Homo-oligomer: A and B are copies of this chain.
Amino acid sequence: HHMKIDILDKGFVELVDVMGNDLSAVRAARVSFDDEERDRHLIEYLMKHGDETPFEHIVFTFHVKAPIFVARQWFRHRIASYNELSGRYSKLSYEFYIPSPERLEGYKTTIPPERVTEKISEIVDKAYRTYLELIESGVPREVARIVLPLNLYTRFFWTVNARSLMNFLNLRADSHAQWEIQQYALAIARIFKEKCPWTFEAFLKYAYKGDIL
């Protein structure tokens, strides 16, 4: 099981593992009441009637590289398991999300988009050089890192079941979410679709509350 989607300038969402498939929900559901067409139909039935427990039996592990401001929003999803790169224990790499100029179109900035991008690059560089200077000076990493900006990239593993993934997408795959987290949500959705096509289609048709998928 492997898929990797690149996101933003340096980010990604990578599928590490998966347990089960659409039929894992069918099998869990069928236990209640003690054929391809009827199995597809049952998935559509569960989704329509809001019986989402059978989808908890499908599980994913992702490996994600995202800016801290993205990761912070993401880790609000409590029904999941995380392990994240540590700024207390690791020397942090010079990797920051610098938005492209096209990210500001629609907005009428009094300076050109290219200069916004550059100003972001500049402050980031200054902050990172300060962080290094502090570390080289003997300041512990856990203190030195507090000067680094929220666009610093972090990495995490994320284990999450299909039900929680549907909740995650209802919130994040939506135009009211910040564009950057939308991009990550589209990548999660794309992988979900690949691995669980019937669940994903049913989700879209019956349960999905957002407007971008």
Contact = CB atoms under 8 A, between A and B. Distances in A.
B145 A150 contact: yes
A213 interface: no
Interface stretch (A28-36, A186-194, A195-203): A28-36
A24 B133 CA distance: 36
Q: How many copies of this protein are present in the complex?
A: 4
Contacts of A56: 81, 159
A65 B139 CA distance: 25
Contact of A17 (B19, B81, B119): B19
A205 interface: no
B87 A109 contact: no
Majority DSSP secondary structure for residues of A touching B: mixed
Interface residues of A, number: 88
A68 interface: yes
Given A143-B103, A147-B150, A87 B69 contact: yes
A101 B209 CA distance: 44
A10 to B, nearest CB: 14
A35 B61 CA distance: 22
A143 B99 contact: yes
Contact of A29 (B42, B78, B83, B152): B83
A48 interface: no
Contact of A83 (B53, B59, B130): B53
B147 A124 contact: yes
Contacts of A16: 27, 33
A90 B143 contact: no
Given A32-B89, A34-B91, A109-B139, 5 more contacts: A30-B89, A33-B89, A34-B90, A34-B155, A116-B134
